[PDB]
Structure 1
Amino acid sequence: SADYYKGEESNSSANKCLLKVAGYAAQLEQYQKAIDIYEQVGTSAMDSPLLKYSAKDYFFKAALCHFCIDMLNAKLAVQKYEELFPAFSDSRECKLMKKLLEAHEEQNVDSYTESVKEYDSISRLDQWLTTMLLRIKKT
């Protein structure tokens, strides 16, 4: 369906289908496709004034999806997102990822879970993000 709509040049509809496919794929434990799709949608959405505000969210999700692969590439991707989309630095997402990475660097799982609980209290979390964070926490 996304290919059919792309052939019709009807944008803003293939993007949602690709995002759904990427999320379900990430749930299926295939992250390269999810990372690529989320990055592509984010780079397609930065230039849009209306969607720009949501773009940060996409970036955040992508950065979380790359977290499982390895810590070093997670830090590198955080740097790349901060440098390419400087506005993203303002959001609390960067602070949250930095605190989580700091907690992992010293095996300080307690700080990790305290930060996760505080953020959840501020705003209730989604099933996908909860599962991703729990799977990461296993390490």
Structure 2
Amino acid sequence: SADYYKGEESNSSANKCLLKVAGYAAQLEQYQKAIDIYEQVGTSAMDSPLLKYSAKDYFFKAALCHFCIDMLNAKLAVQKYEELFPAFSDSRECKLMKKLLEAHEEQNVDSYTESVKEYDSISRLDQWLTTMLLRIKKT
């Protein structure tokens, strides 16, 4: 359906199909497709006037989806995203990722759990994000 919509040049509809595909693929523990789709949609959406506000979120997910692969590439990807979208720094997402990285760099599971609990308390977490965080915490 996304390929058909792209062949019809009707954008903003194939986008949602690609997001659904990437989100479902990320569940299957295949992260490259999810990372690629998320980053592509985020870079497409930065420039839109109306969609700009949402673009940041996509990056977050990608970085989290980039977190399971390994810590170091997640750090460097965070740097790459921040330099491209400086406003991303203002969002709570960057602070949360930095805190989680710092906690995990010393195997400080308690600090990671406390930060996750605080963030969830401020804003309820999604089942997808909950599962991803639990999978990351396994390490």
Q: Distance in 2 between matches of 1:134 and 1:31?
A: 16
What secondary structure is seen at the aligned counterpart in 1 of 2:9? Answer: coil
The normalised TM-score by structure 1 is 0.99
Counting matched residue pairs gives 139
Q: Tell me by how many angstroms 1:28 deviates.
A: 0.6
Q: How many angstroms apart in 2 are the aligned matches of 1:56 and 1:122?
A: 19
Q: Which runs of 4+ in 1 moved over 6 A?
A: none
Residue-by-residue CA offset, 1:61-105 (whole Å, 9 max, x unaligned): 000000000011000000001001111111010000000000000
- Which runs of no fewer than 5 residues in structure 1 stay unpaired? none
Q: Give ranges in structure 2 of 5+ residues lacking alignment.
A: none
Identity %: 100
SS of structure 2 residue aligned to 1:63: helix
State the superposition RMSD in angstroms.
Answer: 0.4
Cα deviation for residue 49 of structure 1 reads 1.3
Counterpart Cα distance in 2 of 1:5 and 1:70: 35
Q: Deviations 1:5-29 (Å, cap 9, x if unpaired)?
A: 0000000000000000000000010
Task: Give secondary structure in 1 for the equivalent of 2:50.
Answer: helix
**Secondary structure, aligned partner of 1:94:** helix
Q: Distance in 2 between matches of 1:82 and 1:106?
A: 24
Q: Distance in 2 between matches of 1:122 and 1:51?
A: 24
